[PDB]
């Protein structure tokens, strides 16, 4: 049943805010948390993400975390800012200076117990908590460093619950600081150990999409987040809407993850939308959703093989046609699906379409091509680390070079793991 949501740092809170805006608009819930919808379908599963308050008000089961107050002051001032439980805003004053070590070891360690208290207060209010979802970036300090620290603490206290992350990967094409490969490599090592499913959201891909197909000439983070919140809506559809498939993170994990460390998913969305009128046919949805240009992780699917795929079609359409089309891409491109996992592609449909579209499709692929993302981060890491450049920001917080060496080794191992099943 209930999922507890956490959003950490600047990127995590800006995308987390947009996500709660998008899906509260879907479920009819207004900024004050009051329902005002048409259908009863909007509220059958409302409890997975919302607590019901006095007067049948709905409040997100969402905790907001930062080491500075800037972004969360803007969340509180944003569209749905008052929908959040005010006690659930947990923030320091220091900031993390885009420093994983500050988020994970010094500044963050000081604040983390305060965050766990609000998590605990949310958990003990759930009839049957199934797990947690975290939105954050890997390239800064709070979302990357403190975010993974929170994931370690949450696992300690809830070792039998599901941990799920939406993780924004840094890219030199959309870059705040040079140390992003350092922060991201340190984060990935944590993620491979302590999450069940990580949606890899590559700022590289988001930029290229905004640039080349949306034809936005100077993409802002705002344009990037439109794509992210649309995609997040799509992947959580079965968690929020009535269907013949239950709102179950564990069953998703069991069906998506054949090997525990290989839980990094490449998301995709169709039709690619910008802030149009033409009906998309089920054949068009299906071909676009599998298109490399609709992938949110800048990896070519034709360079690896799909281990498992989850596909989620939204809107009024022929599930006979969806079924035919899905079976069509599998039988038409059976090279790219491993033959040693029979029937590794599952489709779900939900009659309720996202705002602005009569039909959409969301793609969730566990491809061995995701190794390209981790190699790219690894090469950027190594270019600086072989000269120990910018390390003093980290050693000054108590970190040793050995910890970098280990993190780089573990990520290269993960790369080798993926290569192993791409040739099996």
């Amino acid at each position: 049943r209930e999922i507890v949501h956490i959003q950490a740092g600047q990127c995590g809170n800006q995308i987390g805010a947009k996500f709660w805006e998008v899906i509260s608009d879907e479920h009819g819930i207004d900024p004050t948390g009051s329902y005002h919808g048409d259908s009863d379908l909007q509220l059958e599963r409302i409890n997975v993400y919302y607590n019901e308050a006095t007067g049948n008000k709905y409040v997100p089961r969402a905790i907001l975390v930062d080491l500075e107050p800037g972004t969360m002051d803007s969340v509180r001032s944003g569209p749905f800012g008052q929908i959040f439980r005010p006690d659930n805003f947990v923030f320091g004053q220091s900031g993390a200076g885009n420093n994983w070590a500050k988020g994970h070891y010094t500044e963050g360690a000081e604040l983390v117990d305060s965050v766990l208290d609000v998590v605990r207060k949310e958990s003990e209010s759930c009839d049957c908590l199934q797990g947690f979802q975290l939105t954050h970036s890997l390239g800064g300090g709070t979302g990357s460093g403190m975010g993974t620290l929170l994931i370690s603490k949450i696992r300690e206290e809830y070792p039998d619950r599901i941990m799920n992350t939406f993780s924004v990967m840094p890219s030199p094409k959309v870059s705040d600081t040079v140390v992003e490969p350092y922060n991201a490599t340190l984060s990935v090592h944590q993620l491979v150990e302590n999450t069940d499913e990580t949606y890899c959201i590559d700022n590289e891909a988001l930029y290229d999409i905004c640039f080349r197909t949306l034809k936005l000439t100077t993409p802002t983070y705002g344009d990037l987040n439109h794509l992210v919140s649309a995609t997040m809506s799509g992947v959580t559809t079965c968690l929020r809407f009535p269907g013949q498939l239950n709102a179950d993170l564990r069953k998703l994990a069991v069906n998506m993850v054949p090997f525990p460390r290989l839980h990094f998913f490449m998301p995709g969305f169709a039709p690619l939308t910008s802030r149009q009128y033409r009906a998309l046919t089920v054949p068009e949805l299906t071909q676009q959703m599998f298109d490399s240009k609709n992938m949110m992780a800048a990896c070519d699917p034709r360079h690896g093989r799909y281990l498992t795929v989850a596909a989620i079609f939204r809107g009024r359409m022929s599930m006979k046609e969806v079924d035919e089309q899905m079976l069509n891409v599998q039988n038409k491109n059976s090279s790219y699906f491993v033959e040693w996992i029979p029937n590794n592609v599952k489709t779900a449909v939900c009659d309720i379409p996202p705002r602005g579209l009569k039909m959409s499709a969301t793609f969730i692929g566990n491809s061995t091509a995701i190794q390209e993302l981790f190699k790219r981060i690894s090469e950027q890491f190594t270019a600086m680390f072989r000269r120990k450049a910018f390390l003093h920001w980290y050693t000054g917080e108590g970190m040793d070079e050995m910890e970098f060496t280990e993190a780089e080794s573990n990520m290269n191992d993960l790369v080798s793991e993926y290569q192993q099943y791409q040739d099996a």
Partner: protein
């Protein structure tokens, strides 16, 4: 083709047609199995918490 053993009732009838003639472990073992597996689970949990403590 021989029709034999015909029984009739008000609900129906039955018979047999012959074309051609012919040419569990303990409760103790189960509770033990269920608890061996429980021990393997709590071991694996203890190794995780020891890893988190480090």
């Amino acid at each position: 083709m021989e029709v034999i053993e015909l029984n009739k009732c008000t609900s129906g009838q039955s018979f047999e047609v012959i074309l051609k003639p012919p040419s569990d472990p303990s409760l103790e073992e189960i509770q033990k199995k269920l608890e061996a597996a429980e021990e393997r689970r709590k071991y694996q949990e203890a190794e995780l918490l020891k890893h988190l403590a480090e």
